[PDB]
Design a protein around this ligand. Structure first.
Ligand code: CDL
Ligand code: PLX
Lengths: 69, 57
């Protein structure tokens, strides 16, 4: 029965190790991702949460009938 | 010897030669804030996929 239907304990042992490594890395990635989102939303210095401002190319830099702009 | 200017002459844009130095910061502008640094590097696939709850991709 063991020879025909099953494998040795090493396969399950090392598959468990691989699965555990993947799961732990995903957990730490999720925690880091939440922290990064919080910091970016608080400070606004990252690529995320970049809310639009007025484009400066719309300004007209020509004389304006009056010296004082 | 005064000649009356013709039609179209007093409205010309002309050039002026001056010893007055060109003002540097006429608007009295403050220093502009530094921009957000940049995006750089190569794009790698997401580590272990989306990492949504149970999805392995
Ligand atoms: C024709 C058949 C064919 O050509 O298939 C080739 C294709 C080749 O598969 P493979 O990439 O060599 O094998 C990967 C393994 O499946 C190993 O799986 P994987 O790691 O590639 O898994 C892909 C991943 C992503 O896969 C999916 O999200 C879709 C899978 C179907 C979801 C279950 C409902 C539909 C049935 O699956 C999951 O994330 C598991 C979560 C599944 C539940 C999703 C939420 C619904 C739960 C129930 C409600 O096999 C199939 O398409 C199997 C049928 C589907
Ligand atoms: C000497 C007398 C006493 C002997 C009694 C022996 C007791 C065993 C008999 C009972 C049958 C066991 C139940 C079957 C469950 C096994 C399912 C699974 O585990 O088997 C797969 C293997 O598949 C097997 O072929 C299972 C087939 C069993 C199908 C049962 C059907 C019987 C129904 C009878 C119908 C008869 C005719 C009907 C007429 C109408 C494993 O997949 P695999 O990943 O590859 O194997 C990994 C191990 N390796 C790497 C070493 C290969």
């Amino acid at each position: 029965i063991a020879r025909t239907f099953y494998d040795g304990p090493e396969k399950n042992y090392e598959k468990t190790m691989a699965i555990l490594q993947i799961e732990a890395e995903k957990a730490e990635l999720r925690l880091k991702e939440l922290e990064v989102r919080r910091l970016m939303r608080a400070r606004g210095d990252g690529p995320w949460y970049q809310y639009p401002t007025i484009d400066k190319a719309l300004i007209d830099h020509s004389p304006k009938t009056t010296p004082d702009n | 010897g005064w000649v009356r200017p013709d039609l179209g002459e007093l409205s010309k844009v002309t050039k002026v030669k001056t010893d007055r130095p060109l003002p540097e910061n006429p608007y009295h502008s403050r220093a502009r804030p530094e921009p957000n640094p940049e995006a750089e590097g190569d794009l790698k696939p997401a580590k272990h996929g989306s990492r949504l709850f149970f999805w392995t991709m």
